[PDB]
Amino acid sequence: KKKKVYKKPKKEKHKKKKVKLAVLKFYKVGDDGKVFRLKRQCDNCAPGTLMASHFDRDYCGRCHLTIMKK
Amino acid sequence: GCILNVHPKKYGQGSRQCRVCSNKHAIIRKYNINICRQCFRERADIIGFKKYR
């Protein structure tokens, strides 16, 4: 048969963006003002599973629980 | 997601296959032999079938 022509460029694979020390930004403590959460804790997962602070919703990466703001 | 082997195959040609070859063509089904005709004619004697006339 005839060899097909590739005029349409390749779709690139999706790779995960990396951010250093993600958990360290989750909690911050001053000289005063000891350990204090900065995000939301999930309802139906084990304690310690934080959920994302998206544009207009809060989403959990493990159970896909989304609680809509406003 | 996943779309591997999601078409229902409960009947038709792709539902079953030769017990020996894994070939999908010319399968004997009378009395549940489930063997393609080429394989069966080779092993027909040891199963018990005999030729008389």
Added chain:
Amino acid sequence: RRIRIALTSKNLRAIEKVCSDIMKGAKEKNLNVSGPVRLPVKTLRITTRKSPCGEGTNTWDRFELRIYKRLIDLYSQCEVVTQMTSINIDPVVEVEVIITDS
């Protein structure tokens, strides 16, 4: 009482021999027995084609697998009859001892 012994085998060679042994063996114990009942013989048929390819004169072969069955009724006790079966019956005849209690 009224115990039934049923025999099935692909082989006519052996099934008549076993059916003979039971009738003679039971006669020695002075038992009243009903002679063998030979049920109609049935045959399994398969008619496939030769020639794994497609060409040539279309020829066929006709296969047959025929089955036999016997039936003996007698008046006796179960335990003596069931040990009477295990008398080195050659392993091509499978024996089913069934109590026809009603």
Added chain:
Amino acid sequence: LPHHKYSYIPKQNKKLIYEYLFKEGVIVVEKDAKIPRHPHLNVPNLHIMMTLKSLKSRNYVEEKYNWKHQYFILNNEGIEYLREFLHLPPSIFPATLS
């Protein structure tokens, strides 16, 4: 249960397969990757297919394929291999040897 991809063998499944192989001695796999589970083992049949395949290629088991089945058998080098992996005392042996 974080719902990973199929054929992403968890470390708990691999430990279960080795323990079955050491105690028993042989395993039969029945090659087909659509069956949801093994008769004697509650693991996806695909996971068993990959692990014995890896074991075969390292010269730990030998097998041969009668029509539609696998029939693996362990060797002596396999016995010494697993015991360090699974941390067993130097006296326990597979059943088929005794």
Added chain:
Amino acid sequence: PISKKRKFINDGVFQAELNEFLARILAEDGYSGVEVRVTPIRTEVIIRATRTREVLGDKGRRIRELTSLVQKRFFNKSTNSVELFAERVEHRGLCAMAQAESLRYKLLKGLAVRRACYGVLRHIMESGAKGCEVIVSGKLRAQRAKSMKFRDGYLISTGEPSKRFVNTATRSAQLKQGVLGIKVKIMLPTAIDTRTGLTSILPDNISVLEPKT
């Protein structure tokens, strides 16, 4: 509770797989056949072979693996139903499978094709055969195939007696240049127990008795 028609088929198909499974495990040990006896107490399988020493293994170790293999394949329903027994063939000079497996083994080492067939012929006729025949086909020397036929004695081709009194076997050997076909036909000493279970010593001969003096 299946019917008799389905049950007879299931057992016949069962024996086809088991005989084919063992010929691959026991290929190099003179495999000759298997008889299966399925009793309600415990099911027994009898193996016939020539070199039984290597079949059993050391202290019967390998037969236990074979027992574990058969039981997980065919009798997964229970946990103790099967054992395997080994037996030595009475007369290995007349087992067509034994010779075909023997001839095949030589050909994978590199022996001359003509000597090997002569060697197998002489051993078979030594064991009381009334006739024999060997055939080999494939890429012997050139790029074109050819078949070689070796005969010695007396043989029959037509009729019912040809099925009883003749033993047959077929095997193949995989060389680096292709595949070779091995065919052995052995005509047994003319006894071949008959319809009425009895040795038919004479197939067609009509000898006349000498009148008493």
Added chain:
RNA sequence: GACUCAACACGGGGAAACUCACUAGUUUAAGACAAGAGUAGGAUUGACAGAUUAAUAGCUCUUUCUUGAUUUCUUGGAUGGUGAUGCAUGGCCGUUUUUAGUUCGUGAAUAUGAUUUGUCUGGUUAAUUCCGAUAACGAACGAGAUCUUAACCUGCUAAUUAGCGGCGAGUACACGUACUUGCUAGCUUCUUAGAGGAACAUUGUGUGUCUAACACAAGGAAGUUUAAGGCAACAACAGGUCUGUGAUGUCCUUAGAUGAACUAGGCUGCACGCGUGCUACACUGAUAUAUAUAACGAGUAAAAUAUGCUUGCAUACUUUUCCUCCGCCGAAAGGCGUAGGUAAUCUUUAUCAAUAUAUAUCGUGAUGGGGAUAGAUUAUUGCAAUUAUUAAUCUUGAACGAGGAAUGCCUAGUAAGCAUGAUUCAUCAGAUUGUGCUGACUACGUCCCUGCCCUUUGUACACA
């Protein structure tokens, strides 16, 4: 793929999805093992929402949560492939050929050789099957024998899931018959299935070298080996098949796949030519009603059903699925509810069919022959019916008045006519493979035509 016999209802090839190998798109790693590379201050896997895509493929972007050494990478390597090669092979099958053919020992030809004889002028046979002749005398395969089915036996052995009788009780009619229903001496004609007998050309007449053998008559169930099949000898074909195969050698491909899938199309597309078939051209018929009457078969890990949480996950792994009696609904096709069956026990067979038979209508008019092509409506199979799966109802109403040159198959329960079981099968037979019902005419031969075989003869052919 296959191209005279020996390709063309053949690849068991009746393809809606799958099959699938072809077309257009999009995903996956189910890349063993070794070394490296990467990273626990994180190798990598997964995803709600908006865009986006045929798509509810996080396929890919915007956004940021989750996961934990399973992966990732890099250099070798290794499986897989309905990818090429049947002119590289194994195995299997078709054909020469269902004909009657093929070889060996010793002797002889020899008084070089390739080779010859035995294996033959003649009579006979289905047959190198027999008799005879004879530089040959003896052997082996093939033929025949052998195996399966059918036809005869009131003679043997047996009686359930088979029959016939025997004893009652009934409903009806007669100078004992029909049917229904309880119980149950005996027997095997009917039914089923084991073992035996019978046919040898037996007896006459005729033909024949009177040998091998043939013809007519009697008796006999049977006298063309009694009828039909199964198996099948040396050797060949560059015959078909690597698209049946974890049979297999080389070559090609291996992460932008010729691997594995998923979605939608195609294999069926139509100015024409060819092969196997179905329905017809009517009165020896069409339509309607009624009567009588066969043989071989087949049948039971998923989805679905009972009951809740706000189709998702519990509970029952229950009755479910295969053939389906009977009752009720519906013009019909079908629907609803419950029996029996893993089967000589039930569907169902002292009958599951159509040719046949009886009576009436039509009346030689493309007609009440024929039923193509079309329109509207309904119900089942399936996740999905459009290019209309299949069935049901009402309308429409084409060619075709027995077929040119050519050409096929047939000698008896056969041709022809008539139906039916099974295979493939979720649903579809105008096909194949079996089975039964009704049942002729013509010969008892020949080498004219066509093939194959044998002897003699010619050859410059031997890929013949």
